């Protein structure tokens with residue numbers, strides 16, 4: 039079996055910014071989710087080979103994970119906060135699409151998403 043290449047985290051011809059909203063997304067939002075007891079499945083791309091999930095990347099065509107988001111934030115990959123918020127939402131959605139209601143992983147994603155929503159509710163004005 040084979041994993042796909044990970045999402046890109048570097049692209050020199052993509053225009054970039056470091057806005058106060060993006061700073062908040064790193065220092066408050068990512069940091070909060072990263073340290074959570076349920077973060078670990080989301081801290082790197084889904085390894086479909088070692089999890090024995092040969093259908094994962096058949097079903098999930100827009101992979102995203104917090105390891106990727108962390109790298110994107112640390113390397114100032116984004117132009118705006120909405121791009122990054124979309125990445126978090128892609129990560130959660132992927133989990134709900136692939137897995138079954140009530141599965142441990144879904145409970146984990148739901149706990150992280152609750153915190154995510156609480157933090158982005160107070161996203162600072164630009």
Ligand SMILES: CN1C(=O)C[C@@H](c2ccccc2)Nc2ccccc21
Nearest residue numbers: 078079080084089091133136137143
């Ligand atoms: C984020 N993630 C998954 O969505 C896969 C899920 C899983 C389902 C069935 C069998 C094995 C794993 N849980 C999971 C576990 C570890 C890392 C990522 C995931």
